Amino acid sequence: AYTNSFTRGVYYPDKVFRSSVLHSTQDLFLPFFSNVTWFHAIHVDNPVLPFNDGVYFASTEKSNI
Amino acid sequence: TKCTLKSFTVEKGIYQTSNFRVQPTESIVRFPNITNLCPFDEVFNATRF
Amino acid sequence: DSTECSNLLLQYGSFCTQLKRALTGIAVEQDKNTQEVFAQVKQIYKTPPIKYFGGFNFSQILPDPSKPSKRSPIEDLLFNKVTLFNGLTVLPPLLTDEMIAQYTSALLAGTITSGWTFGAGPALQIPFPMQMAYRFNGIGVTQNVLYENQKLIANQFNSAIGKIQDSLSSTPSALGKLQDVVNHNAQALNTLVKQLSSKFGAISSVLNDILSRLDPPEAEVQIDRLITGRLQSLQTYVTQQLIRAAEIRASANLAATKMSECVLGQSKRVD
């Protein structure tokens, strides 16, 4: 399947504290509104996916599967 | 002041001669803080070689 | 404060002396501008206590004895409407705000009680309606016109002064120019300080690492770049300041002329 990724995936890149300020950084991010592959945990089992440069893995589950 | 103006006679006025900067009084050991080493008392105090 | 860097900076000459001279020139110029604009009157004229001038209501511009800063209400509105190291220091001005407000109050008292006279010599007191009648003649209207509409004229004037404050408060960008001056200076310094982080081609921006992870012979050529780059950045900054200072001086001369001609007298120059 497919689904656009909304404003998600941002992370603290430099572990440096800054207060009430705007900062511009060039790094590997997840572009907003980009589609992301969707998979299900029912049965088969899971294909290998290449690691181009970095992966954003989200999971919604309630059984520690 | 004479040295800056390069003149034996300085006229009435105010002149910026130089700058001062308080010097550091101490050095603070430059360190993070450790915690542990590796196996040496298990290679030299070994029971059987 | 790196010894080796001062030792290498000695090879460029007297550049820093030269620029320092330029900046001191700018500073003294700023003080002279304020002097020229405001310090035109010689004596601090005080306003009489019984503030009745034939219906005209100057409460909005005369200094407020209530507030401690003693600024008129319009002046207070102005103060609230506009708002806002590595060897960089912003010297304070010579005339404090208080003294400037005092000069302005002097000019107001002079013009209210003496007309233009106080600008040509000894201040001569004159009743305010007659002063305005004089000015009416100045624009070619017979003075009887003023005596017959004194009440009405006074009302129009009071209402206009009242709408001024509301206009300044409601106008979103009335103070664009002063705000712009402040912002330009702040931004200039910001870029100057931020540019210390650039490497300019050197292997690193902090000198300590440069001198640590490298032998002295190669550290020399790695420090040349930092020196020249920071020097050039500073040089551009100084030039920008010279140009802006010339512009502001032109404006200040214009202000001084306006003071003299419009405040201390009556001008026939159109518009």
Partner: protein
């Protein structure tokens, strides 16, 4: 992280994975201890320019010194909004200023000493206003005032190549 300065107890909340603090323009403002994890503020130790006040070689050798961006509590002595001034005594009297120090303070030779004082903006003249009184001049005086203006500068020519490399 290497630097110099005075360390002070901080009041800002570093996030637990953070090691640095920065103000605008990358100035490292704070740091947490690698041992006790306490936040510390960094302030560069005081520095500044020094200026000399002199009444003229030909009047006297006395001199007063002004440390501009500093307070002497960490250097006669006097404190001003412009910095702390040493060598001149502050007097309550106000005069017409000749050596401008700043923030309304000036200095001059007393006569035998260097005195700092607040400027005087002139004498007070309370003109007598009234709704029916007029002051008219009965005599006059014609004066002459001189105004000077520069008109031109020296015309200069430079030979590029010669100046460059002879």
């Amino acid at each position: 992280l290497t630097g110099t300065g005075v360390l002070t107890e901080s009041n800002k909340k570093f996030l637990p994975f953070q090691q640095f603090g920065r103000d605008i323009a990358d100035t490292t403002d704070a740091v947490r201890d690698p041992q006790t994890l306490e936040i510390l503020d960094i302030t560069p130790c005081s520095f500044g320019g020094v200026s000399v006040i002199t009444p003229g070689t030909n009047t006297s050798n006395q001199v007063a010194v002004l440390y501009q961006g500093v307070n002497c509590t960490e250097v006669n002595v006097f404190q001003t909004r412009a910095g702390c001034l040493i060598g001149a005594e502050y007097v309550n009297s106000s005069y017409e200023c000749d050596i401008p120090i700043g923030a309304g303070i000036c200095a001059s030779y007393q006569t035998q000493s260097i005195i700092a004082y607040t400027m005087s903006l002139g004498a007070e003249n309370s003109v007598a206003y009234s709704n029916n009184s007029i002051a008219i001049p009965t005599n006059f005086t014609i004066s002459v005032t001189t105004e000077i203006l520069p008109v031109s500068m020296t015309k200069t020519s430079v030979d590029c190549t010669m100046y460059i490399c002879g």
